[PDB]
Amino acid sequence: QISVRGLAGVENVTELKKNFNRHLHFTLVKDRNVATPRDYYFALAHTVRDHLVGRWIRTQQHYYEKDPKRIYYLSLEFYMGRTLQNTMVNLALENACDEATYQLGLDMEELEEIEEDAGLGNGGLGRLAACFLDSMATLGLAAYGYGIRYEFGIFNQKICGGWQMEEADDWLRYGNPWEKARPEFTLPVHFYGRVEHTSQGAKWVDTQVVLAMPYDTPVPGYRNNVVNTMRLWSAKAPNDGYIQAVLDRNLAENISRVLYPNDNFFEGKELRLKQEYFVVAATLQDIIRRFKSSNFDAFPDKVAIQLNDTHPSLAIPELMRVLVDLERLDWDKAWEVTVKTCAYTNHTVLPEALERWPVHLLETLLPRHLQIIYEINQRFLNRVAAAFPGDVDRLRRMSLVEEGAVKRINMAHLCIAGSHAVNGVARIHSEILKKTIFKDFYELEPHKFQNKTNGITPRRWLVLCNPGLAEIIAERIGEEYISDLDQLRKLLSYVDDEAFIRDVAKVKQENKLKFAAYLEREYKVHINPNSLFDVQVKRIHEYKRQLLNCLHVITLYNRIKKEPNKFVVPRTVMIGGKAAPGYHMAKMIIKLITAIGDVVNHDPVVGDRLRVIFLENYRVSLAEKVIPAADLSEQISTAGTEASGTGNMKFMLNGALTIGTMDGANVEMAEEAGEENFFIFGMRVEDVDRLDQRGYNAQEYYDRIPELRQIIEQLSSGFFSPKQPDLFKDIVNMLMHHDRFKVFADYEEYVKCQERVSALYKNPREWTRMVIRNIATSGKFSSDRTIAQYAREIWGVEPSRQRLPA
Numbered sequence: 126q127i128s129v130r131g132l133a134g135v136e137n138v139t140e141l142k143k144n145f146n147r148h149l150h151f152t153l154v155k156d157r158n159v160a161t162p163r164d165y166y167f168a169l170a171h172t173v174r175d176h177l178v179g180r181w182i183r184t185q186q187h188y189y190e191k192d193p194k195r196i197y198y199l200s201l202e203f204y205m206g207r208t209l210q211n212t213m214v215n216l217a218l219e220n221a222c223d224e225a226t227y228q229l230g231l232d233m234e235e236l237e238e239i240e241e242d243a244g245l246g247n248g249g250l251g252r253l254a255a256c257f258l259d260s261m262a263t264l265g266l267a268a269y270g271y272g273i274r275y276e277f278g279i280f281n282q283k284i285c286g287g288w289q290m291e292e293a294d295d296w297l298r299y300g301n302p303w304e305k306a307r308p309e310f311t312l313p314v315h316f317y318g319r320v321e322h323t324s325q326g327a328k329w330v331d332t333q334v335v336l337a338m339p340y341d342t343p344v345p346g347y348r349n350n351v352v353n354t355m356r357l358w359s360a361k362a363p364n365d366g367y368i369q370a371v372l373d374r375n376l377a378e379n380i381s382r383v384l385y386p387n388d389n390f391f392e393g394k395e396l397r398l399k400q401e402y403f404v405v406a407a408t409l410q411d412i413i414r415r416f417k418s419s420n421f422d423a424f425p426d427k428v429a430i431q432l433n434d435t436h437p438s439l440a441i442p443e444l445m446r447v448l449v450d451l452e453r454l455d456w457d458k459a460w461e462v463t464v465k466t467c468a469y470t471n472h473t474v475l476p477e478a479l480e481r482w483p484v485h486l487l488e489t490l491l492p493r494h495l496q497i498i499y500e501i502n503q504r505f506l507n508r509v510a511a512a513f514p515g516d517v518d519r520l521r522r523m524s525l526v527e528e529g530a531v532k533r534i535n536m537a538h539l540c541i542a543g544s545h546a547v548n549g550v551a552r553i554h555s556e557i558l559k560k561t562i563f564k565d566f567y568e569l570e571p572h573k574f575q576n577k578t579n580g581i582t583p584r585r586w587l588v589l590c591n592p593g594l595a596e597i598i599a600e601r602i603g604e605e606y607i608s609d610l611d612q613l614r615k616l617l618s619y620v621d622d623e624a625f626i627r628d629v630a631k632v633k634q635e636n637k638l639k640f641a642a643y644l645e646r647e648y649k650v651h652i653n654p655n656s657l658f659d660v661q662v663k664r665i666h667e668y669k670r671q672l673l674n675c676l677h678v679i680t681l682y683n684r685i686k687k688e689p690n691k692f693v694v695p696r697t698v699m700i701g702g703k704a705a706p707g708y709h710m711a712k713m714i715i716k717l718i719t720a721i722g723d724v725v726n727h728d729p730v731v732g733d734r735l736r737v738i739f740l741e742n743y744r745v746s747l748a749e750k751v752i753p754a755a756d757l758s759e760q761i762s763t764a765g766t767e768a769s770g771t772g773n774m775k776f777m778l779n780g781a782l783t784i785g786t787m788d789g790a791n792v793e794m795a796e797e798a799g800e801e802n803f804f805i806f807g808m809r810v811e812d813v814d815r816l817d818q819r820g821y822n823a824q825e826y827y828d829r830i831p832e833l834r835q836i837i838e839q840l841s842s843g844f845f846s847p848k849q850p851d852l853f854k855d856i857v858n859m860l861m862h863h864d865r866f867k868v869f870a871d872y873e874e875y876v877k878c879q880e881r882v883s884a885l886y887k888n889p890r891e892w893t894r895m896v897i898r899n900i901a902t903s904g905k906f907s908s909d910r911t912i913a914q915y916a917r918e919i920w921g922v923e924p925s926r927q928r929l930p931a
């Protein structure tokens with residue numbers, strides 16, 4: 126037992142054992158003779174859940190009495206992962222439960238592995254929402270996460286013959302002990318219909334109704350007895366030949382069935398539009414109800430709505446609809462209230478990712494909202510015209526309505542017009558927003574534009590996943606850093622401490638052994654634990670340049686084959702991540718990685734000097750295992766393409782060094798740690814711009830770099846696919862003729878930088894000292910810092926570290 130995991134007092138252990146047995150009997154209806162590990166998991170989950178309930182009821186009661194300003198975080202994604210360990214950590218129950226289960230003859234770590242991830246997100250954006258909920262609870266904010274309860278989250282990834290296969294993620298099959306259904310608070314949502322203009326304003330009539338039923342999940346703050354709520358809506362048909370009519374209820378209920386996995390490319394799918402309106406319409410009724418339970422002038426003083434990307438952008442015209450059509454406020458007053466209530470966070474600059482909904486879809490599904498959007502647009506463009514008289518092209522560029530073959534609504538433009546604050550997610554990204562894609566808006570309303578650099582929760586991403594590191598840190602500086610990560614700066618005093626150097630290195634070794642064991646047990650593959658663990662885990666995208674990593678791997682293989690008896694630093698290269706189902710190039714990249722592995726891992730001349738592993742089914746629970754085990758974090762996106770990144774921050778906190786471009790939050794990470802303690806390579810944003818101006822010619826690099834030429838020839842000729850020699854011709858073609866992300870342009874600098882990594886790894890003491898310098902300066906990247914900045918600079922509320930009574 127370790128100190129950061131809390132006390133195992135005799136009274137507590139006795140009480141936990143008793144309640145475990147009670148739940149096994151009364152809740153699960155099992156006896157100890159036929160109980161499985163799954164039953165034991167559920168008995169523990171219910172036992173821990175019981176400790177949340179008093180705190181949850183009294184937190185919500187406290188908000189009702191004190192009536193603080195409420196923060197509503199609207200997201201289509203909440204990538205929560207597992208709940209059991211996080212709850213124990215935040216309630217200081219971990220050691221007590223470990224003791225209670227041990228005394229019952231059970232291994233708690235084995236029970237933890239049974240829990241399904243709540244995979245209600247795709248990647249960074251979804252996981253950010255999850256870290257944010259944890260920080261908002263920890264900082265005592267009256268905050269509510271609102272989303273959709275998907276029946277199926279992000280698909281499970283299987284690799285079959287080197288190819289991605291998708292399997293439905295039936296995460297609710299065994300039940301969800303954490304949620305509470307609230308069928309009594311079911312609300313109607315309207316679709317289709319038509320608008321009637323009466324003498325008494327507009328009326329939206331002849332609609333189809335879908336019911337929104339809420340399920341509430343507790344969100345505990347770190348040891349402060351605050352328990353906030355995540356409310357997720359589920360779609361239900363209303364109760365009003367016969368057989369078919371009952372069967373057709375599925376059509377309504379399909380709204381909450383499945384998370385869209387296409388994080389690369391916007392497609393105008395009606396079902397996704399319905400999901401976006403569903404969450405917005407149900408949430409806003411809940412917001413207004415809560416506000417009316419103690420004149421809309423005070424609405425922005427009592428309510429903040431944060432839009433996570435443009436996905437809940439319909440909140441803007443929905444709030445207008447409610448205020449104008451139902452509450453009878455004049456347009457100007459309603460608009461003032463709306464702007465002061467709403468704020469918008471942008472997460473990407475790639476044009477193909479922006480939501481641009483066809484007008485014809487909105488006209489049919491949401492005819493009143495389309496009318497409101499047109500009126501917003503006309504009044505907004507009137508302001509632009511008065512500020513920039515005669516600038517007709519600006520009017521076209523800034524319009525919410527896009528002209529063309531199909532007319533579209535630009536949802537980002539809608540969000541900027543209707544929000545008092547617009548933020549990017551890292552300093553470089555927020556600057557790019559002002560200088561490029563939203564330049565016109567910045568010139569009109571400079572005061573709207575902000576930066577809020579992303580962060581991660583140090584509860585899940587240090588204490589939970591890396592208790593060994595948390596403990597050795599706590600031994601020297603105490604426990605206060607867990608909720609005040611800036612205190613890690615105190616560790617700079619230990620950079621020459623021989624004991625600390627040894628302890629940091631020991632913790633990493635243990636994490637690596639544990640992960641190496643996990644790979645053999647669960648996936649039947651053997652790795653050398655003394656090799657450098659070189660890790661790139663993230664969704665598969667061309668911009669993230671898993672392909673550049675692949676080129677380096679093949680370079681190393683070719684160098685070994687050329688000089689087999691020369692010493693090289695042994696590496697285990699691990700790449701993992703899911704590809705969007707319809708993204709052909711991303712699926713080809715996965716196949717390339719496994720194909721390289723097939724050749725490299727079976728070459729007797731290589732031995733255990735180089736191994737290439739594709740990490741199947743990358744998800745939050747796997748990140749918690751692999752990140753503490755990593756030596757080298759690959760953060761290699763083309764400069765200007767990754768808005769922030771957050772995986773980068775997880776690796777920094779956990780004792781990996783970073784090889785990266787000056788992109789997204791990497792810039793600020795290098796600034797914090799010092800450029801000498803970071804492996805920076807490649808084009809800066811300015812260099813990318815210069816290449817675009819003269820034109821990117823991949824052929825030039827192929828002609829001048831013989832090692833690069835060899836790799837392309839190998840790919841083309843069928844070296845990595847002997848039975849299908851032309852398998853990778855799409856990859857070669859893209860690289861040579863149509864590469865938006867300039868893979869070849871960074872190749873030479875990348876390979877050279879990787880040599881410097883290997884050089885440092887040969888000197889374990891200096892490697893570990895650089896690691897200490899990274900861990901010690903990771904404090905800025907706590908989501909507590911991020912949320913404090915949102916609270917003070919956008920929401921107009923003060924964070925609190927003070928305990929509620931237990």
Ligand SMILES: O=C(CCc1ccc(-c2ccccc2)cc1)NC(=O)N[C@@H]1O[C@H](CO)[C@@H](O)[C@H](O)[C@H]1O
Nearest residue numbers: 247249250385387388397472550767768769770771
């Ligand atoms: O996952 C997503 C988008 C997912 C998504 C999923 C589905 C649809 C969709 C829209 C319309 C029709 C059908 C589907 C759009 C987007 N984005 C994301 O993760 N962005 C990352 O946000 C992180 C948090 O700010 C940043 O650190 C990363 O830089 C950014 O790439």
Ligand SMILES: O=c1[nH]cnc2c1ncn2[C@@H]1O[C@@H](COP(=O)(O)O)[C@@H](O)[C@H]1O
Nearest residue numbers: 182183185186187188189190411415418
């Ligand atoms: O009319 C009331 N009388 C007493 N307590 C209330 C009343 N309405 C709401 N509350 C409290 O505040 C609620 C929090 O849930 P909400 O209605 O979603 O904000 C409940 O859990 C109650 O504890």
Ligand SMILES: *Cc1c(COP(=O)(O)O)cnc(C)c1O
Nearest residue numbers: 248249663744745748770771772
């Ligand atoms: C942190 C995290 C991400 C985001 O990683 P990036 O490298 O920033 O894209 C994606 N998926 C999972 C499961 C994560 O935990």
